[PDB]
Design a protein around this nucleic acid. Structure first.
Ligand SMILES: [Mg+2]
Ligand SMILES: [Mg+2]
Ligand SMILES: [Mg+2]
Ligand SMILES: [Mg+2]
Ligand SMILES: [Mg+2]
Ligand SMILES: [Mg+2]
Ligand SMILES: [Mg+2]
Ligand SMILES: [Mg+2]
Ligand SMILES: [Mg+2]
Ligand SMILES: [Mg+2]
Ligand SMILES: [Mg+2]
Ligand SMILES: [Mg+2]
Ligand SMILES: [Mg+2]
Ligand SMILES: [Mg+2]
Ligand SMILES: [Mg+2]
Ligand SMILES: [Mg+2]
Ligand SMILES: [Mg+2]
Ligand SMILES: [Mg+2]
Ligand SMILES: [Mg+2]
Ligand SMILES: [Mg+2]
Lengths: 249, 198, 119, 162, 38
RNA sequence: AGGUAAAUAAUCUAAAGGGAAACAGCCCAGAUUAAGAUAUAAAGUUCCUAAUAAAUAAUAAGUGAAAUAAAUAUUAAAAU
RNA sequence: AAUAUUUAAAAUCAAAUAUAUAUAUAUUUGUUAAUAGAUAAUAUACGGAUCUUAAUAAUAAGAAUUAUUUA
RNA sequence: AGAGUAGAUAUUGUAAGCUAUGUUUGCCACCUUCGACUCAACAUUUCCUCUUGGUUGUAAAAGCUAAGAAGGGUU
RNA sequence: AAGCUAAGUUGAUAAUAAAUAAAUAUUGAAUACAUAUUAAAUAUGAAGUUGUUUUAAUAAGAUAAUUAAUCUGAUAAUUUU
């Protein structure tokens, strides 16, 4: 019960006042952000096929996005994590491939070992979907607009001509060996150095890409596919995050 | 000092009281400063109103003859006696507001220029000419009435607010010197230019 | 233009105080020289040191340099000088016909006390 | 002879509290005092090669005193190294972004010596805009001061810790 | 607005003004006389 | 013009040390070798950085605070 | 309290020095501020921090600017 | 000062006055490649795009002049 | 044929909001009058600012297992996403 402790008069008599809100704080940042009011899906890009409108005959390319065992694993909240998000898991995996720690995690959350896990940030708590619920393609509406995020194809160590569209030099008129080079990469003694961000040859691709306002053309559950007008970043069998568009509806 | 030294005549139906607050707010300047912790309240038949006044200004009552005076400690301070004059003017204006009221008449000169009231008399719509609807909503303490589409009456108990709302409405279309066109706040007028086409 | 001789155009309080003390020191040197001459005159006439110092009549110097230095109109004492002439010296190539006394070479050794009446 | 004895008390990092609500010094003057404390000049056992500084806790920084129009005019600079990237933020904006104590932290950092000990002396300063801090128990107190403090205040400072 | 370092009062209806750390002249009669001390 | 040509000092040239942020030429002072108690020069004494306490007025423009930018314009101060 | 050149210590006035003890001659000093005009190119540059103060209110701050000075 | 149907100050401002830049032609003597192609970074003394004041000389349209403005653009 | 590619296909030019510049106002004195303030109070206002959107790098924080014949990585083999 009683223990020896001493109190400083300055602290004891200090008047209590509340510190003001600073912009560089999760609460204010979350208030400022531009986020959807609903959770999304994880899909696996399967490839592209034609889409023919039965009525007007329009033909448009469409990517096929597979929905396979998409379940909500757990939630994130403002009072515990600083933002509202739904962690979603896609697919089925094998014991041998999943680790013991993550096997315990999936067991605790009452889901099967998952191919992929990624979390979608919602605006508030109304958009959190209960854990363990299976999400189907019909989760989206025909003719609505979504945003798709995925890692794009790798192009390797790419030169300046391909990477940034430099014109290079002439193929004739005395041009010396350096045909496909970027030219000058700075100025004379005044800078005395190459400014940061100078465009130079280097690895291109394997980078995240967000494509906004992609139209959902067809949704069906008997095949477990979602049709997206246009193209999606990444090779085949690449994971894609689909979520309602923030700009158009 | 001449403005602030003029006394105030208060009718039996209007009363003025002065009190203090809990949080004195102290505003700063260069070598000078101000501290504000008092409040004056005017009550009358047409509602109630209030003003914030510093601690260096006091009100002397007189029930006989219904007379009240406003004075500060040190008139040697220019930055004090200016406030004394302004506070006298403000309290007097509030007294006029409560006893009688403040009114402003907007005239809409120009063909098709007219104003209407919508949303239970809260919104005012003006047609000074635009492909987009124009107007705004009245603030608290102001009431508007339209005897004619081409005329509008804005009145209340706070002179500053009534006239600021009038000016905000006028901002959409001030008078045009070539042909009289726009919103006229009061009896004030403009001088027109000759035609003298080239 | 090219070299940076970063000499500010106005002195500081400490510099002014040191200048005042230096002026006072020169005044003291002049005073002591005159007093020594007076005491020597008294001792030559016969008196001794004590009443040479206590003598009511003080002998004035007979040399041109000492007499002129003792005249206030030629070598004014520190307390007699003006604040302007304590710190600023006369120059005919400067705006205002003045320059800081600290821009004079070897200003802590050389002495300036008087400038033209109307400058 | 004077040096021979128990130096453990001498080289002890005390914790000091400065309540800006009660303090009357302005930003720069308060910061100069804080820098002196952090360096440890106030200790007669100070030697330049050693870091004899103490901890400092500042509370109620939202009442700090700044003179003139510095709040709306003083600018803080930052440049990464790429030309055209000179961030200039007014004190008002820096306060709204990172708080009032950030200004004091910059002032103290400027007044500290430019050594390898600069950052470890700076991290020794704890600043809080409000009164709620986790170092209420980490403040020098003596048994002879407890008389003025009422019992419920002691119970609050003991049991209601963060 | 005649922005100029020399600000005068031409029309007798000109009036001086002290705003935004600057000196202004506004004329009630002739609008050409508006000036600002830049 | 950090130009050029000569005329009086002084310093660098051939001069370390303190101040001028950094500094051949400016302010002070001339290192035989040490010691570190005392009096100091120029310059300074909120912190970086050794060392300060006051009086009387003015400034509110961060003016200014160790490299004063002009004619002019506005707003303010007293003598009859 | 109103019409109101000039920005002054020459002249006048007021304090002090050297001769003079009932008073005079000579000498020394004391006469405005703020803003605007303002002004480029890797990066804001008093060397940097920073510097103007405020009752309640605690050991305890209130130029670190300019002009005369004291200890 | 003078033009501007009238009025020096919408615009305009002719000899002279006070300053700013260090892009021009020169001056000193500390220090013995012009154009094109490619990629450009920076400034604002803003050509276009946005906000605004003036204009017997802004009825509308198109303009002239000026204040804020370097985000984007500028064969 | 696959792949790469553009002459081809798809999408975007990242809001809504908050303070402002020039500039436009209400009440109002010191200074009877006048004055939007280089007084106290009360409002409008830009492709610019803060932000937002997009992509790097960081991991505060969170779930889970914790000496294991199916605990976590590596060396190794068959390979491209
Ligand atoms: Mg080619
Ligand atoms: Mg060759
Ligand atoms: Mg070839
Ligand atoms: Mg080269
Ligand atoms: Mg030469
Ligand atoms: Mg020599
Ligand atoms: Mg030689
Ligand atoms: Mg030397
Ligand atoms: Mg220094
Ligand atoms: Mg040095
Ligand atoms: Mg400055
Ligand atoms: Mg005289
Ligand atoms: Mg610069
Ligand atoms: Mg003419
Ligand atoms: Mg000419
Ligand atoms: Mg500009
Ligand atoms: Mg037009
Ligand atoms: Mg009035
Ligand atoms: Mg008006
Ligand atoms: Mg805008």
């Amino acid at each position: 019960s009683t223990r020896p402790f001493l109190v400083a008069p300055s602290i004891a008599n200090s008047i209590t006042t509340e510190a003001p809100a600073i912009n560089h704080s999760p609460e204010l940042a979350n208030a400022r952000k531009w986020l959807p009011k609903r959770c999304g899906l994880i899909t696996r890009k399967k490839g592209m096929m034609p889409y023919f409108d039965k009525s007007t005959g329009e033909r448009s390319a469409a990517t096929i996005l597979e929905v396979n065992n998409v379940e909500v694993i757990m939630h994130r909240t403002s009072e515990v994590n600083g933002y509202f998000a739904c962690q979603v898991g896609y697919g089925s995996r094998h014991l041998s491939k999943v680790s013991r720690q993550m096997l315990g995690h999936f067991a605790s959350k009452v889901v099967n070992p998952k191919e992929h896990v990624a979390e979608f940030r919602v605006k508030d708590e109304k958009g959190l979907i209960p854990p363990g619920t299976l999400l189907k393609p019909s989760f989206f509406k025909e003719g609505q607009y979504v945003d798709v995020r995925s890692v794009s194809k790798g192009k390797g160590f790419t030169g300046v001509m391909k990477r940034y569209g430099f014109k290079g030099l002439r193929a004739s008129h005395g041009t010396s060996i350096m045909h496909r080079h970027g030219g000058s990469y700075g100025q004379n003694q005044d800078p005395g150095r190459v400014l940061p961000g100078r465009k130079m040859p280097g690895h291109m691709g394997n980078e995240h890409v967000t494509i906004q306002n992609v139209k959902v053309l067809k949704v069906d559950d008997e095949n477990n596919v979602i049709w997206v007008k246009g193209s999606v970043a990444g090779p085949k069998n690449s994971f894609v995050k689909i979520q309602d568009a923030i700009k158009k509806t | 000092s001449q403005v602030g030294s003029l006394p105030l005549y208060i009718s039996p139906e209007v009363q003025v009281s002065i009190n203090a607050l809990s949080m004195p707010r102290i505003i700063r300047k260069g070598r000078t400063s101000m501290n504000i912790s008092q409040n004056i309240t005017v009550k009358g038949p047409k509602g109630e109103l209030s003003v914030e006044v510093p601690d260096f200004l006091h009100l002397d009552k007189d029930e006989k003859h219904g007379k009240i005076n406003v004075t500060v400690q040190n008139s040697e301070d220019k930055h004090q006696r200016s406030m004394w004059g302004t506070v006298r003017s403000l309290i007097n204006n509030h007294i006029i507001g409560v006893t009688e009221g403040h009114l402003a008449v907007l005239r809409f000169v120009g063909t098709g220029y007219r104003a209407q009231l919508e949303n239970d008399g809260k919104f005012v719509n003006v047609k000074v000419g635009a492909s987009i609807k124009q107007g705004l909503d009245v603030p608290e303490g102001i009431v508007v009435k339209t005897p004619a589409p081409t005329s509008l009456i804005i009145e209340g108990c706070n002179k500053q607010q009534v006239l600021l709302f009038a000016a905000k409405l006028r901002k959409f279309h001030p008078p045009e010197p070539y042909k009289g066109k726009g919103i006229y706040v009061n009896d004030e007028t403009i001088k027109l230019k000759d035609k003298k086409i080239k | 233009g090219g070299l940076l001789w970063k000499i500010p155009w106005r002195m500081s309080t400490h510099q002014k105080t040191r200048q005042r003390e230096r002026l006072r020191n020169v005044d003291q040197v002049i005073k002591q020289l005159t007093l020594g001459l007076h005491v020597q005159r008294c001792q030559d006439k016969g008196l001794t040191y004590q009443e040479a110092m206590e003598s009511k009549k003080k002998y004035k110097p007979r040399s041109k340099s000492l007499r002129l230095l003792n005249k206030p109109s030629v070598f004014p004492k520190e307390n007699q000088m003006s604040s302007k002439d304590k710190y600023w010296t006369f120059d005919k190539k400067a705006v205002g016909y003045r320059k800081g006394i600290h821009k004079v070479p070897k200003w802590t050794k050389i002495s300036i006390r008087k400038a033209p009446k109307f400058f | 002879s004077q040096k021979i004895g128990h130096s453990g008390l001498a080289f002890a990092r005390l914790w000091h509290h400065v309540d800006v609500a009660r303090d009357k010094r302005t930003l720069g003057r308060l910061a100069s005092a804080i820098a002196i404390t952090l360096i440890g000049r106030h200790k007669p056992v100070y030697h330049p090669s050693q870091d004899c500084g103490d901890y400092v806790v500042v509370t109620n920084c939202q009442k700090i005193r700044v003179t003139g129009k510095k709040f709306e005019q003083k600018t803080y600079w930052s440049h990464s190294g790429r030309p055209g990237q000179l961030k200039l933020q007014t004190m008002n904006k820096v306060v709204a972004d990172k708080g009032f104590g950030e200004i004091l932290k910059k002032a103290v950092s400027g007044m500290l010596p430019k050594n390898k000990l600069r950052k470890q002396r700076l991290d020794r300063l704890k600043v809080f805009d409000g009164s709620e801090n986790p170092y209420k128990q980490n403040i020098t107190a003596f048994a002879h001061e407890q008389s003025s403090i009422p019992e419920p205040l002691k119970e609050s400072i003991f049991n209601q810790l963060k | 607005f005649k922005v100029r370092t020399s600000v005068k009062k031409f029309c007798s209806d000109c009036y001086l003004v002290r705003r935004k750390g600057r000196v202004y002249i506004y004329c009630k009669s002739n609008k050409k006389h508006k000036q600002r001390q830049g």
